[PDB]
Amino acid sequence: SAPVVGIIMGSQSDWETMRHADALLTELEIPHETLIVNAHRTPDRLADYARTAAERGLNVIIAGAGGAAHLPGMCAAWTRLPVLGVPVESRALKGMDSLLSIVQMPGGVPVGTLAIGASGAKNAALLAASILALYNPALAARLETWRALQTASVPNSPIT
């Protein structure tokens, strides 16, 4: 089936983080594509990807980047689709540079930003799912089940 979510990242090194978004979308059976698109090394690839995303049938883009993290913001610049940004943990500054360069978008071009690291990648997929669930009843039911299981599965006490 045709992808409705695009997951993009700038390098193989981002995959350790973004694989968590990929896994969640697969778990919820949301058709998606997972690609490398680098804002700095392949800016024309980025322009083409973002500009054509809507006409290709994409509904949400999840973009991960670390350091001076420009990939989500520049993606949002070229598409009217919702763009969700995952700050990848950077070696020196632990993703604080990633976080500020993604979340601090000036008014007019938004990026919905999630937590630094694996938690953010998982949550970007969940946020994408909740967006798609607004107009897909079967997915809405699967997301309901996912959240219910998450809630029900929390133990009552720690193991010592």
Among positions 17-36, residues that touch a second copy (CB under 8 A) are: 18-20, 22, 34-36
- Angstrom distances, CA of residue 31 to CA of 4, 7, 153: 6, 11, 26
Q: What is the bridge-based pairing of β-strands 60-66 and 32-36?
A: unpaired
142 binds a second copy (CB under 8 A): no
Cα separations in angstroms, 52 against 6, 57, 82 = 12, 9, 14
Minimum distance from CB of 8 to a second copy (Å)?
A: 10
Q: Which is nearer to a second copy, 1 or 121 (CB)?
A: 121
Please work out the total of residues on this chain that contact a second copy, with binding judged by CB under 8 A. Answer: 91
Residue of 5, 25, 39, 53 interacting with a second copy (CB under 8 A): 39
Per-residue binder mask for a second copy (CB under 8 A), 78-117, x = binder: x-xxx-x----xxxxxxxxx-xxxxxxxxxxxxxxxxxxx
